Amino acid sequence: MKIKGVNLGNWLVLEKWMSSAIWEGTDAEDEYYLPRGLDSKVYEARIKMHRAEYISERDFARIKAMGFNSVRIPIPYFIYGDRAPFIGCIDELDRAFSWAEKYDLKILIDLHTVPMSQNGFDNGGLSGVCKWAQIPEEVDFVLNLLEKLAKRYGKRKGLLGIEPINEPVSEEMWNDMGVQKRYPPLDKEMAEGSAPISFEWLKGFYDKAADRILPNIDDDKYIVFHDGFRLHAWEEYLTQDRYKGRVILDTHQYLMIAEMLGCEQTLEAYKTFIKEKFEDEITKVEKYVPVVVGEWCIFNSYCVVSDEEKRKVYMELSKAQLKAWDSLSGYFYWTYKMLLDPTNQATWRGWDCWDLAKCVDEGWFPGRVA
Amino acid sequence: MKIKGVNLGNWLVLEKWMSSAIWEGTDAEDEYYLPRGLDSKVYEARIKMHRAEYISERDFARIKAMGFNSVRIPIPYFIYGDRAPFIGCIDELDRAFSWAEKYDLKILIDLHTVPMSQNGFDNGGLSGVCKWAQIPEEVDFVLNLLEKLAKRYGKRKGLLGIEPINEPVSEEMWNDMGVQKRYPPLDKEMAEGSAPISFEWLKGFYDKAADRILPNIDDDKYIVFHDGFRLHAWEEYLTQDRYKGRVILDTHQYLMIAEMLGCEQTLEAYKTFIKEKFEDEITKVEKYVPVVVGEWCIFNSYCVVSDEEKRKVYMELSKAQLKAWDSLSGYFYWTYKMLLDPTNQATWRGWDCWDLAKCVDEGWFPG
C-alpha cells in the first residue's frame, strides 16, 4: 500500500476561509448558519453553483496527471438530502466516483460533519458546539448514513474505503485549544454542556461503525479510523481479528506545529523536525497498523524573504514530508484546491500554499509524485 | 513578444455549451434571456458565484506555469454595470489585471458582445438578432465603452491590447453559415431587419474605435482588429502610416472548418490542410501586418478509436497548428477552461479537447 492522495476540501463541506464568495452578504462563520442568513433560493443558487464548479471531471484528470492515485472526499451528514435546510449532494458523490473510475483513482469517503458536531471546530460546520456524541438520536442517524453509503459504494472499483468520522475531539485537544473561544458559538445555550469524546466512547462508536460498514463493502475495501488526536492509543483496538487486513489509521500532521514547539526557522531545522517528530514517531504506529497522514500541508511561518527563496523552502519542505510519508502507508494533502486571493487580500499572503495544485504551478511542490 | 495565449471564454461572457449549472431551470439559450428566466435574486446569485469560481488567481498561476504569456478575455458590453438587467464585472477585470501583472502575463481585452449583436451567434449573447451596426446610439455606446476601457487600462503593465469588437459577421458568413436557423431568434420582431456587417462600414467603425483607443494606450500596446471573417481584405487599411507598429489583425482558424469544406477525416489530411490553408495563406498576411490567430483548437471529428490513438492524433494536431502559428505573431487557444462531463453526459465525448488545461493533463497538448 502506497496511497498518494489529495483532499477535496471545501467542495461538499464548506470551510469559510477557503472561498469568500458563497459567504458574502451574511454574518455566518460556518455551514450551519449560512442558510440562516439567506433567502432559501439564494442559498440553493449559491450552493448548486459552488458544487457544480468547485470540483468537476477536469480536476480528476489533473489529480491523475500529477501522479496521485487516491482522493479523500469530506462529505456532510446531510448528504442524502433529508436534513433541512441543507441541500443533499448524493449526485455529486456519484459523479465523483464515475470520474475517479475513469482516471483509475480511488476515493476515501470521509464523513466530515455530524449533527451538533464532534469537535466544535468551524471545520465541523457548527462553531463552538460539540454535542453529537451526547445525542443518541444523532449518533444512530450517522450510523444509518454510513450503512447507506457502504451499501451504495461498497463494490465500486473506485472505492478505497470509508472513514466513519473526522476529527472527534479528545479531552486534551478540547481543553488545550480552548475551542469555544477560537470558534465562538452563536447560540450560547445551544453550546452549553458540550463535552469532548472519550477514547472508550469512540471505540464503541467504531465498533458500531464497523458493524454497518464492513458487512457492506467488498473484502478488499478498507475502513479508515481517525486517531481522535491520540496517535499512539490504537494498537490493542486495531489489531483485533476482525480488523486484520481491513483497517487504516488516519493521523493529521501539520508542519506548523514545529515553530510553536520552537523549531529554528531554517530548512535543516525543519527537516530534522520532520524526521524526528513526524517520521520517527509515526512509523512506531505503522509497525502494527497501516497509517495514512490524511491531512498535512507545507504551510510555515518562514515563508510568510524573497519569492525565489520561499519557492526553495516550500519545495524542500514538500520533498521532506513526502520522504517521511514513504515509510508509512500513504498520505492525503490538505488540500487540492482553494479560491484564495493573496494578491488582493494581503493578509492571506503565505496561505495559498494550502492549495496543492497552486503549489505545483508555483514550484512549491513536485509536479509528479509517481 | 510572440503571443502565446489562451482565451478566458465563458467567464464574463457566457456561452451555454461550456457550463451547465448556471442554466438549470431555464430554457434560455444565451446571455440575453438568462436573466429573464430566473428571479432577480437567483440570477445575481448564480452570476457572482460563477464569476467567483470560474477564474481566479490560481488560474493565472496555472496559465503561466503551462508556458503561456498572454490571455485574451472576452468582456460583455454591460461590463460597467450600466445595462440592466445585466450585472457589471469591472471588479473581475481589475482582479484579472492584478493577477496578470503578478505572474507576468499580458491581457488582451476583447469586446465580445454588443447591444443587439454584431453576428447573431449564441456566443454574441443574443441568438438570431444582428442589428447593432444599424443602431447609431448603441454604436456610440460601444465607442464610449472602448474609450473608458482604454483610459482605465492603457498604461498598465498587464495590458497587451484592446479588441474593439469580436466577430462582426460578413455577408459570406451570414449567408454561408445560415446564422438565424443555426441560432434561431426568440423574438422574431426583434430580429426583423438583421443584416451582416459590410467591410466598408466596419472600417469606418475601426476608424472610430482607433480614435478612442489609440490616444489613451501606451506605445507598446496595440489595437487588435478582428478580420471580419475577411482574412485577406486588410492590406491597404492596416498599412496606413498611423497604424505602423500599433496594430494586430486577429483571425479565427478552426480545424473543423476543414470537414465542412470536404476535408478527409484523417490525420494526414488534417495536417496538409493545416499547412496549406492555415500556415501558407496566413503567413502572406503576416508579411504586411502582425497577425494573431485569436481563436483555434484541436477539435476534429476523427477523434469524436483507441484512447492511445486519440491522444497521438490530438497531440499531433496541437504540434502541427503550433508549428503553423510560429511564423505568425501569436495565438490564443479557445478556450482555457470548460465544465463538461463527458463521463456521464456522453454527448460531449470528443468535445473536452476544447478545454486547454484538460488537454495538457490528457497529453493532448504539449506540457
Task: Tell which phi-psi region holds residue A37, choosing left (phi > 0), alpha (psi between -120 and 50) or beta.
Answer: alpha
Residues in chain B: 367
Rounded Cα distance, B22 and A296, in Å: 34
Rounded Cα distance, B312 and B35, in Å: 43
Rounded Cα distance, B358 and B365, in Å: 9
- For this entry, resolution in Å reads 2.5
Phi, psi of B65, rounded to the nearest 5 degrees: -65, -30
Using a CB-CB cut-off of 8 Å, the residues of chain A touching B339 are 52-53, 56, 58
Rounded Cα distance, B32 and B38, in Å: 12
Looking only at the bridges linking them, the beta strands covering A330-333 and B3-7 are: unpaired
- Provide the residue type at B321 as one letter: Q
* A 201-230 near B (Cβ less than 8 A): none
Q: Which residue of B has its CA nearest to A41?
A: B42
C-alpha gyration radius of chain B:
20
Using a CB-CB cut-off of 8 Å, the residues of chain A touching B48 are 21, 24
Beta carbons of B357 and A62 less than 8 Å apart: yes
Secondary structure of residue A110 in the 3-state scheme: strand
Using a CB-CB cut-off of 8 Å, the residues of chain A touching B52 are 19-21, 339
Secondary structure of residue A30 in the 3-state scheme: coil
Secondary structure of residue A232 in the 3-state scheme: coil
Distance from CA of A46 to the nearest CA of B (A): 6
List Cα–Cα distances, B156 to B100, B143, B159, B218, in angstroms: 10, 21, 6, 9
Phi, psi of B43, rounded to the nearest 5 degrees: -55, -55
DSSP codes joined into one string, B297-310: ----TTT---HHHH
Which contiguous run of DSSP H or E holds residue B222? strand B222-226
Rounded Cα distance, A259 and A257, in Å: 6
Residues in chain A: 370
The stretches of A74-185 forming alpha helices (DSSP H) are: 90-102, 136-153, 171-176, 179-182
CB distance A131 to A184 below 8 Å: no
Q: Where are the domains of chain B?
A: 5-362
Beta carbons of A41 and B41 less than 8 Å apart: yes
Secondary structure of residue A295 in the 3-state scheme: strand
CATH architecture for residues B5-362: Alpha-Beta Barrel (3.20)
Nearest to residue A271, comparing CAs of A305, A317, A333, A312?
A: A317
Rounded Cα distance, A82 and A98, in Å: 24
Q: DSSP E strands: which ranges in chain A?
A: 3-7, 70-75, 106-111, 159-163, 222-226, 247-252, 291-296, 330-333
Rounded Cα distance, A354 and B93, in Å: 25
The Cβ-side half-sphere exposure at B229, using a 13 Å CA radius, reads: 18
Using a CB-CB cut-off of 8 Å, the residues of chain B touching A352 are 57-58
Q: Tell me how far the alpha carbon of residue A324 is from its chain's centroid.
A: 19
Burial of A224 per CB tally in 10 Å (0-12, 13-18, 19+): buried
C-beta atoms surrounding B11 within 10 Å: 25
Domain A3-362 has CATH 3.30.2270.10: no
Rounded Cα distance, B190 and A5, in Å: 54
Experimental technique used? X-ray
C-beta atoms surrounding B359 within 10 Å: 22
C-beta atoms surrounding A342 within 10 Å: 17
Secondary structure of residue B108 in the 3-state scheme: strand
Size of interface A-B (CB pairs under 8 A): 114
DSSP codes joined into one string, A157-193: TTEEEEES-S-PPPHHHHHHTTHHHHS--SSHHHHTT
Calculate the dihedral angle through the C-alpha atoms of B312, B314, B316, B318, rounding to the nearest 10 degrees. -150
